[PDB]
């Protein structure tokens, strides 16, 4: 077979790359596993290369090494050069992730994950799924994320009027999907349906999911929705952080058809508030949030009439001093009759409805030195309570991972920056 047919003698000047040196089709590697690729030149004599990974210059080697240490996913291509000529190869890789095994937790401005089988943290999956993609969310601005539909909707209340405020990220993949400039100061998100959701901050912005135009309704400075949720065709919002108000509601199908201007009705409910505080949908059917009293707080049941039951609490609920620090909100069970309550000394209380027993004493204590600075979240899967907390005296933040009988299973560290909230793709 000497000399006959092919051989470099009659196959140009240009780079030759062998068959199979270079991938053919999308590659799928494991976390922890290393891309390698080694193109194989017939004639290697002056080349130079160009390894780009999503358009940006990554290697200068002859041979491509990329650890697949996060979730990610990447377009690939290989520009090989000589005196002669230049050929480009494209490509593309992704990781083999599960975001079902574990949760996502906004901190530092992005989307991170907690892998609670391997017990391993994922810093910035936003990102490396997203071609480098930021969510611009600085240390002065707020995010506010509500996950419905299959979808992330993030609000970013932010002083930036020219930007995107208003995002949607797919919750099973982290893809990017939309995003939109609404308005600055906007930290108040309502997801009403499918079709349309409501901004807070100023007054009243309905916004459409698809298309992303909102329409100012009300105009109202400084009124935010720091809570809201649906409840028998009808908004419940939270618009105080410290002044005397009561729990008003709005008309879902009011908000929908009404115009630019056209301020909706508010009715308002004998809920008196005085901080920011959450309403939870409970296994009972039942709408739950809390009413500011002198010695304590009272538990709040809202029923589909919207008449009120009240429990009192002997114990101040847990608050934030400002217009920008979160919710410290409550959490329900899908499958307990349960709330989860947290206590201005940092100790969580574990309500069972109708039972005012089982506010006596918390469920898990207070530690010294040690508050809780984000809302709760709750595995509905495995009946895990996530609790956020901040070493007060040095700015250290974990999110301890609770059984449902309180004892400790995981500890992701957070350092300097606080998790806002987490979430789950499913
Ligand atoms: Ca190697
Ligand atoms: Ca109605
Ligand atoms: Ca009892
Ligand atoms: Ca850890
Ligand atoms: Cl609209």
């Given at each position: 077979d000497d000399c006959e047919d092919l051989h470099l003698g009659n196959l140009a000047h240009y780079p030759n790359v062998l068959k199979?040196?270079?991938?053919?089709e999308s590659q799928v590697l494991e976390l922890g596993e290393t891309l390698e690729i080694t193109p194989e030149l017939?004639?290697?004599?002056?080349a130079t290369y160009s390894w780009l990974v999503n358009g940006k210059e990554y290697s200068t080697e002859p041979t491509f090494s990329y650890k697949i240490d996060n979730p990610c996913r990447a377009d690939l291509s290989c520009i090989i050069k000589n005196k002669y000529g230049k050929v480009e190869m494209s490509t593309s890789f992704s990781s083999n992730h599960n975001f079902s095994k574990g949760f996502f937790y906004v901190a530092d401005g992005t989307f991170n994950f907690y892998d609670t089988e391997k017990k391993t943290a994922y810093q910035d999956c936003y990102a490396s799924l997203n071609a480098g993609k930021t969510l611009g969310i600085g240390n002065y601005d707020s995010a506010n994320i509500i996950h419905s539909n299959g979808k992330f909707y993030l609000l970013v209340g932010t002083?930036?009027?020219?930007?995107?405020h208003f995002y949607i990220v797919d919750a099973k993949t982290l893809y990017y999907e939309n995003s939109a400039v609404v308005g600055a100061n906007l930290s108040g998100l309502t997801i009403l349906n499918e079709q349309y959701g409501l901004v807070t901050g100023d007054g009243i912005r309905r916004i459409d999911l698809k298309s992303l135009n909102n329409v100012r309704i009300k105009n109202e400075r400084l009124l935010c929705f720091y809570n809201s949720i649906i409840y028998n065709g009808k908004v419940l919002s939270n618009d105080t952080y410290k002044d005397e108000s009561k729990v008003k509601y709005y008309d879902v199908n009011e908000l929908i058809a009404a115009k630019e201007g056209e301020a909706p009705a508010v009715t308002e409910l004998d809920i008196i508030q005085k901080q920011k505080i959450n309403f939870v949908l409970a296994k009972d059917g039942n709408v739950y949030t809390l009413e500011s009293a002198d010695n304590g707080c009272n538990i709040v049941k809202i029923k589909n009439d919207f008449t009120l039951e009240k429990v009192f609490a002997n114990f101040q609920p847990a608050k934030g001093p400002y217009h920008s620090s979160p919710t410290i909100g409550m959490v329900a069970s899908e499958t307990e009759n349960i709330i989860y309550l947290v206590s201005t000394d940092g100790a969580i209380y574990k309500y069972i409805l109708?039972?005012?027993?089982?506010?006596?004493?918390?469920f898990i204590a207070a530690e010294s030195?040690?508050?809780?600075?984000a809302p709760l979240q709750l595995n509905?899967?495995?009946?895990e309570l996530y609790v956020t907390y901040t070493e007060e005296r040095k700015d250290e933040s974990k999110i301890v991972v609770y059984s449902k009988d309180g004892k400790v299973l995981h500890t992701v560290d957070c350092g300097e920056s606080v998790p806002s909230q987490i979430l789950f793709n499913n």
């Open positions: 199979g040196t270079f991938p053919t017939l004639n290697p004599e002056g002083s930036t009027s020219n930007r995107d109708g039972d005012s027993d089982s506010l006596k004493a918390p030195g040690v508050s809780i600075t509905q899967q495995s009946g």
